């Protein structure tokens, strides 16, 4: 139950790891094959230490979902070493990454295509009462179809629902994708979440460029503050650099749902 559903256990003779493609806050990651013969995705941990119970945590999360364009969690390894977490495997990795890689080589309505899906995930995640907290374009991986799908669900909170409110005691956040509201009163709402799906639009529509450039997080809240918003970027139809602009309201209820974000986009293509 903490978190023991619907964590499948999955035993170790089953796992063959082939390569690292990655390393987490937590350990290496691997690509590898399960047999029940399938390619997974394997996150291990590392002497570790209570790193572990938030390890496992995060797939006590993604194990309630099942969502199209949310990570599917295939189990865990609990029992033995190294700890893992086993989950399908995506091609081409995460989605800031691979934009800088493939810089220019995708048209406009493919990328809005790309930025449905995420937003249909997080439609999905919002609908079970959940609020990420952590959405930028490197916890979104993509398969080698160019879905989209969200994967990374350690800042994750349940909420509730007029004002469904989590308010944090603090912790690392990440500063250039977090509405003002939250940085600064700490209150985080599906609203702050479309706050950071505007960043990752315009993160998307600038082929992996980093949000407010090389401006330190010190001076990017003060901007943000005195209603500075990021620029449009090249090529950006004017209807999705004005949904990203929806999307950063300084006010949480004047932001857009995210049920409203996929009929938008929907239209747009």
């Given at each position: 139950?903490?978190?023991?559903?619907?964590?499948?256990?999955?035993?170790?003779?089953?796992?063959?790891?082939?390569?690292?493609?990655?390393?987490?806050?937590?350990?290496?990651?691997?690509?590898?094959?399960?047999?029940?013969?399938?390619?997974?995705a394997?996150?291990?941990?590392?002497?570790?230490?209570?790193?572990?119970?938030?390890?496992?945590?995060?797939?006590?999360?993604?194990?309630?979902?099942?969502?199209?364009?949310?990570i599917?969690?295939?189990?865990?390894?609990?029992?033995?070493?190294?700890?893992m977490?086993?989950?399908?495997?995506?091609?081409?990795?995460?989605?800031?990454?691979?934009?800088?890689?493939?810089?220019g080589?995708?048209?406009?309505?493919?990328?809005?295509?790309?930025?449905?899906?995420?937003?249909?995930?997080?439609?999905?995640?919002?609908?079970?009462?959940?609020?990420?907290?952590?959405?930028?374009?490197?916890?979104?991986?993509?398969?080698?179809?160019?879905?989209?799908?969200?994967?990374?669900?350690?800042?994750?909170?349940?909420?509730?629902?007029?004002?469904?409110?989590?308010?944090?005691?603090?912790?690392?956040?990440?500063?250039?994708?977090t509405?003002?509201?939250?940085?600064?009163?700490?209150?985080?709402?599906?609203?702050?979440?479309?706050?950071?799906?505007?960043?990752?639009?315009?993160?998307?529509?600038?082929?992996?460029?980093?949000?407010?450039?090389?401006?330190?997080?010190?001076?990017?809240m003060?901007?943000?503050?005195?209603?500075?918003?990021?620029?449009?970027?090249?090529?950006?139809?004017?209807?999705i650099?004005?949904?990203?602009?929806?999307?950063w309201?300084?006010?949480?209820?004047?932001r857009?749902?995210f049920?409203?974000?996929?009929?938008?986009?929907?239209?747009?293509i």
């Open positions: 139950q903490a978190v023991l559903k619907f964590t499948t256990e999955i035993h170790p003779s089953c796992v063959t790891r082939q390569k690292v493609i990655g390393a987490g806050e937590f350990g290496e990651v691997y690509k590898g094959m399960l047999k029940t013969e399938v390619p997974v394997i996150k291990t941990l590392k002497g570790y230490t209570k790193q572990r119970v938030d390890f496992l945590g995060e797939a006590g999360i993604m194990g309630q979902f099942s969502h199209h364009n949310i599917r969690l295939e189990g865990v390894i609990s029992k033995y070493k190294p700890m977490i086993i989950t399908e495997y995506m091609e081409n990795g995460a989605l800031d990454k691979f934009l800088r890689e493939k810089d080589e995708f048209s406009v309505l493919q990328l809005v295509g790309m930025l449905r899906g995420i937003a249909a995930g997080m439609k999905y995640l919002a609908n079970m009462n959940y609020v990420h907290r952590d959405l930028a374009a490197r916890n979104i991986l993509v398969n080698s179809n160019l879905v989209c799908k969200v994967s990374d669900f350690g800042l994750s909170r349940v909420l509730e629902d007029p004002e469904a409110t989590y308010t944090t005691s603090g912790g690392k956040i990440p500063i250039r994708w509405a003002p509201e939250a940085i600064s009163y700490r209150k985080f709402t599906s609203a702050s979440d479309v706050w950071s799906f505007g960043i990752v639009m315009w993160e998307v529509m600038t082929y992996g460029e980093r949000p407010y450039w090389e401006l330190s997080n010190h001076e990017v003060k901007a943000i503050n005195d209603g500075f918003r990021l620029p449009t970027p090249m090529d950006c139809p004017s209807a650099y004005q949904l990203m602009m929806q999307c309201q300084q006010e949480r209820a004047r857009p749902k049920a409203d974000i996929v009929s938008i986009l929907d239209k747009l």
